[PDB]
């Protein structure tokens, strides 16, 4: 309500949102994509691609 200059340097400008970033996520999906055992009545074992996790 009162203005003054409500932006001061820090923690006068931090009672608002203050840069909501990298919220905790289910990008890798448990209980759906994993924790999954609905795997189809396939034919053979074709391949399982191995990737060196550089990143």
């Amino acid at each position: 309500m009162y203005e003054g200059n409500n932006m001061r340097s820090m923690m006068g400008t931090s009672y608002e949102d203050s840069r909501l970033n990298k919220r905790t996520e289910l990008n890798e999906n448990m209980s759906i994509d994993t924790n999954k055992s609905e795997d189809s009545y396939g034919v053979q074992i074709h391949s399982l691609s191995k990737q060196s996790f550089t990143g």
Partner: protein, 192 residues
């Protein structure tokens, strides 16, 4: 396989690693990487009994991760480093292509054989065999644990001609590094 794909500190071999003696570390698995490893007899059983006689395989068939073998061992491992004595063992080795072994050679314990050789008098007691004793044997992984580095850049060496016997000669090198990483979920199943 339902246990492997949960947020859990179990199921890995992080406690054998360097810093992970004390500590706690979680992994998961994604099932787009898991493989199982059994005999072909077990594969023939669950192909013959389990997915056959169960009335509902709407997504239950995990048979697309099954590596099979006639048996899990024909490979023989050296203990008790020794010197090989007899001509009969050595020209037995000549049948399998080992040109370089003679009656002046030792056998280290870093060597394998991959064919049935333990009937030889210089191999009984020294060399043992790789096999699960109970034969009801399921070793389940992900493929990201095993790693397999072959090197075939100098794959074919140049030939040696030797005109004086009129006899060309070829060599083949290749390098290979087969190891596994203990940082992933592994479950062994036996009756041991």
């Amino acid at each position: 396989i339902l246990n492997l794909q949960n947020n859990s500190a179990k199921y890995n071999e992080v406690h054998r690693a360097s810093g992970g003696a004390i500590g706690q570390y979680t992994t998961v698995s994604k099932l787009k990487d898991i493989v199982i490893l059994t005999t072909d007899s077990l594969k023939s059983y669950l192909l013959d009994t389990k997915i056959a006689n169960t009335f509902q395989i709407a997504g239950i068939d995990f048979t697309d991760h099954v590596i099979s073998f006639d048996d899990l061992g024909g490979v023989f491992k050296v203990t008790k480093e020794f010197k090989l004595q007899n001509q009969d063992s050595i020209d037995f080795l000549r049948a399998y292509g080992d040109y370089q072994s003679q009656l002046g050679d030792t056998i280290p314990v870093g060597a394998v054989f991959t064919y049935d050789v333990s009937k030889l008098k210089e191999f009984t007691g020294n060399v043992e065999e790789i096999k699960p004793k109970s034969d009801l044997y399921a070793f389940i992984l992900d493929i990201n644990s095993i790693k397999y580095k072959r090197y075939t850049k100098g794959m074919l060496k140049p030939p040696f001609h030797n005109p004086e016997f009129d006899e060309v000669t070829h060599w083949i090198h290749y390098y290979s590094f087969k190891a596994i990483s203990p940082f992933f979920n592994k479950i062994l199943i036996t009756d041991q």
